[PDB]
RNA sequence: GUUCACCACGGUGUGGUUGAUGACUGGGGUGAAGUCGUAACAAGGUAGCCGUAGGGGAACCUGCGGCUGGAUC
RNA sequence: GCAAGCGUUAAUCGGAAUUACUGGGCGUAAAGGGAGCGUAGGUGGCUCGAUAAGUCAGAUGUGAAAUCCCCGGGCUUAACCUGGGAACUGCAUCUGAUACUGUUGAGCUAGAGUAUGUGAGAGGAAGGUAGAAUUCCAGGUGUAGCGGUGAAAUGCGUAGAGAUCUGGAGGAAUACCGAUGGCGAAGGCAGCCUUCUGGCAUAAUACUGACACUGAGGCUCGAAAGCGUGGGUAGCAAACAGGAUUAGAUACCCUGGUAGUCCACGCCGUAAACGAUGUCUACUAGUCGUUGGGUCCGGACUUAGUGACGCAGCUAACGCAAUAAGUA
RNA sequence: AAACUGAAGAGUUUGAUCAUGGCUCAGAUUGAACGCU
RNA sequence: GGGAGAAGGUACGCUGUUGAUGGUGAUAGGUCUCCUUGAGCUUUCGACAGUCGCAGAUACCAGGCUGCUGCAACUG
């Protein structure tokens, strides 16, 4: 899974203010980050379906907030998926 | 039903079909004895029912 | 989640007095204070104040009136709810127990009662018949 | 007048849809004091029922899981 | 009872609130999708503005006449004819209003989410391992029964069974703990250990600032049985065989017994998949348990579950009753 | 001045009951037909 | 996968005009070399207009097709 130091890094580059770490950018980029990690686990084990609930939450819940920032500021949306290569 | 769903669908009457189709929506029809017997009735009665089957002009036996 | 707020004021009237609670308290708006103002002034409530919390909050709270030792709001029914919003003429507002009751309406000059509507000579969206 | 173009009739082929019929066959219903049993209702005499599979003249039986809409405890 | 008509048949609406918009239901009467995630859609917090589309009001134009209704007029009355109104719930275009819905700008934190610390748990997936017990095999002792049933018999046994002790092979399940206990969306999930991994509960602070709820089609998961391929195979056991019982006994009981149950990877997609109770939100007497946290002084309180009671309310009744079938 | 006036239930499941629920009936109507007149 | 060339239709010669296009590449412009233009030759598809005959895939050459059913899976 992801630690303490690489999540910290990962809010710290997608910071929008000071020690935010609530914003569409930083839960995006957390939860990509999250997801990233956990498609090594389920090439693992891919009859894993309780843990494959969770991932497919937390990509219902990315798609959301992407959702969100395009209707909040376009631009912002568009740059953001640029970085994280969605 | 919601109000949505009254929209969505929408409640539908059956219409019953009538209980004379061999007359075909008129108040008689003429036709011709094609055989006259008696029969006997359900359950509970007792009688030799005088009773004809009778092709009319609507297509009907 | 809650998708009625009027629904809501009405029902925690309507269970509080069910219940013959003193008061009611709410979070508040300005949709709230109206409806609360129009039912003081029609004498369904003795008060409806509003207090300012922190965090730009509010309350509304709302003294029941008990007639008798019965209800005075005998029924509060919403009948403009989100589902279905009723709006009606200056000729087609309901009337509530043959005009005993009230139609709460809400009209371009604001909450106010049925019959002060039809003097008025203007209609709008009917939320509530309380009587 | 001739010729070409457009085109109605009509023709050819190959499909689709649908009505009526059809030896035979499947189930449904009605009808008598018929034959075989007695599966269910009581703990209905092996608690019943649901899904499923196998079996059996027939109701049904049996296995596996589930339910209580199971009495006696 | 009607009467120059009276009945019957056909047909439409009514009664039928019996498709319920007005105006019904879904625990057990018919009726909650097995569960979830989510697309279109439907709906949607607080505050200050803008707009004026919905909405409301006014004006204008039109909404043919006839018909319906009201006030009259003419037939001797009436039917009928006829004047004027009303209505034609509508549409269109201007004008006004801005409470609500829509569209927008800014702000907010209460719904919803994020970061950080602790905690519980049969949550899931992959490996390993342990101890009982069964079966089988090989031996030692030992001798005439064992086994089974309501009785029996089939069966096993003097070629030495069963019992007893010692080794070996193997498979499956995990006694006690164990609990209207726990976890999981449901289906489900129990030995122990490691690895990989989901959700949840909790205290405070910080952060985003309505990002929400539900959800037709769709997709995912989904007991057991069953199917395909490949392994395994101890016990149990459909089918099947024999023995009983019986009038018969394709059963129930007995003795055996194969598929299956086990594993891997796939199909199937159904259950009384049940709380026969869709999901989410708010509010509404109380009492007693229990699980996981938390805070105070063995108790007190507060949370999220999980139970038993019990008001008001509801219900045809049974009953439900903050885990509603109450009020919305 | 007026056009603003309109809303009934019964029988039938049971030993009886309440509910559910279908069936049936009493009304109005017709470009009607048929029967008696 | 197929069945399937299922079945069954239409066009087809020559003459003129005309559109598109592949290859090769003389002559020029910037050393078994490269790039651009491209003469002559050549390829492949069309369109329009006419014209002759009974007949234009004109000779040779060159699938007959379909329905029901038994058997064996098939190539061998």
Redesign the pocket.
């Known amino acids: ?1 992801l630690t ?1 130091s690489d ?2 890094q990962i ?1 710290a580059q997608y910071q ?2 000071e ?6 950018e ?2 995006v980029a ?1 939860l990509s980050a ?1 997801i990233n ?2 498609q090594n ?1 389920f090439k ?8 494959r ?6 990509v ?2 990315r ?3 992407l959702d ?1 920032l395009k ?2 500021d376009l631009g912002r949306y568009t740059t953001l998926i640029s970085q994280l290569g969605l | ?1 919601t109000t ?1 769903q ?1 929209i969505r669908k929408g ?6 079909k ?3 189709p061999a ?1 075909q ?4 029809r003429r036709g011709v004895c094609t055989r006259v017997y008696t029969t006997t009735p ?2 509970p009665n007792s009688a030799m029912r005088k009773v004809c089957r009778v092709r009319l002009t609507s297509g009907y036996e | ?5 009027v ?2 004021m ?3 009237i ?3 007095q ?2 013959n ?1 003193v008061s009611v308290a709410m ?5 709230r204070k ?1 409806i609360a103002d129009l039912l003081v002034s029609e004498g369904y409530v003795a008060s409806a104040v509003v207090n300012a919390e922190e ?4 309350t509304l709270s709302i003294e029941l009136k008990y007639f008798e030792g019965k209800a005075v709001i005998e029924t509060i ?2 009948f403009s709810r ?2 279905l ?1 009723q ?5 087609a507002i309901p009337t509530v127990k043959q005009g005993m009751g009230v139609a709460i309406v ?6 106010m009662s049925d019959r002060a509507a039809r003097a008025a ?5 009917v939320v509530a018949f309380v009587a």
Not at chain 1, 19 to 24: A, H, R
Not at chain 1, 53 to 58: S, Y
Not at chain 3, 55 to 58: E, G, P
């Open positions: 899974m303490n999540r910290e809010i929008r203010g020690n935010d770490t609530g914003s569409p930083v839960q957390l999250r990690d956990l686990h693992a084990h891919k009859a894993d379906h309780h843990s609930r969770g991932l497919i939450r937390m219902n819940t798609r959301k907030l969100y209707g909040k | 039903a949505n009254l409640r539908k009457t059956i219409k019953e009538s209980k004379v007359l929506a008129c108040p008689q359900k359950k | 989640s809650m998708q009625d707020t629904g809501d009405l029902t925690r309507r269970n509080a069910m219940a609670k979070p508040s708006s300005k949709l109206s965090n730009n909050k509010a029914q919403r989100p589902g919003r709006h009606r003429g200056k000729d809400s009209t371009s000059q604001g909450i000579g203007i209609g709008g969206e």
